Design a protein around this ligand. Structure first.
Ligand SMILES: c1cncc(-c2nc3ccccc3[nH]2)c1
Length: 273
């Protein structure tokens, strides 16, 4: 069983998402993360291609868990009487982007460009797989420090991607768009672009741009750090008040600020090693 298959290490974190432990798969010593989610705390349920009742998080992880290393892979899952247990891949050494920015401050634009580009490729992979993450933020991005590769984590607030309006949201409010704050309605892709604008500002400024609902609604972007005109333009574009005024993923990646991105290995060599 699960208890014999894995060696439980220390607690990595806990919160709204449940409890995550560091672990090692006993068969090949593979580093893993073991996430426990209480059944009474799971509101969104779904079903696998076969039809088993599992948390939506398990459905979304299976839809995205393949070759591409930009999303944390689900290796296995187990059902207990009062909880679900998820076995996830674990990079080592690792640091989440929130801890990284907290320690190092505002990122050099070359580093933010490499990181932001990788988040964009990871989000495009999710959307291509029919998955909307809904909680893109620094805390949900892991940095594989040796490879300079970023990985999206925590699909616990996610949903299947659709072209119609969403009227439910349980992600992070300070990353949520003005249409959600004002109308409790949003479309998946343009809400994801707004959160990406919040994240890019966070990378280049060292903190998020808005704290209160009133600021999100006003959408006036003030730069507290020295940021290039091209980067400021891209941020202000992702943070357009009208969802239809926001760039598509293609327009973000074709933006002049996004040109000449470093490869992840070059990024680790210059900025992380
Ligand atoms: C919050 C919510 N859901 C999952 C996590 C999570 N997954 C991980 C995978 C590897 C290492 C650390 C990890 N932390 C954190």
């Amino acid at each position: 069983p699960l208890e014999s298959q894995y060696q439980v290490g220390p607690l990595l974190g806990s919160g709204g998402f449940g409890s995550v432990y560091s672990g090692i798969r006993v068969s090949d010593n593979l580093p893993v993360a073991i996430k426990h989610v209480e059944k009474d705390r799971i509101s969104d349920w779904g079903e696998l291609p076969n039809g088993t009742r599992v948390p939506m998080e398990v459905v979304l992880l299976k839809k995205v868990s393949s070759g591409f290393s930009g999303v944390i892979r689900l290796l296995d899952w187990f059902e207990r009487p009062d909880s679900f247990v998820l076995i996830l891949e674990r990079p080592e050494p690792v640091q989440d982007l929130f801890d990284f920015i907290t320690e190092r401050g505002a990122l050099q634009e070359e580093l933010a460009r490499s990181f932001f580009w990788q988040v964009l490729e990871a989000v495009r992979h999710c959307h291509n797989c029919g998955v909307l993450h809904r909680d893109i933020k620094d805390e949900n991005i892991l940095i594989d420090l040796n490879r300079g590769e970023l990985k999206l984590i925590d699909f616990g607030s996610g949903a299947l991607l659709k072209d119609t309006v969403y009227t439910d949201f349980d992600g992070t409010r300070v990353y949520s768009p003005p249409e959600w704050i004002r109308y409790h309605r949003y479309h998946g892709r343009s809400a994801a672009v707004w959160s990406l604008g919040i994240l890019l500002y966070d990378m280049v400024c060292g903190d998020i741009p808005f704290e209160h609902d009133e600021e999100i609604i006003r959408g006036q972007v003030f730069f507290r750090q020295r940021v290039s005109s091209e980067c400021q333009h891209l941020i202000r574009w992702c943070l357009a008040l009208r969802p239809s005024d926001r760039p598509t993923f293609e327009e973000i990646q074709n933006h002049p600020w996004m040109q000449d991105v470093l490869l992840p290995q070059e990024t680790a060599e210059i900025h992380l090693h």
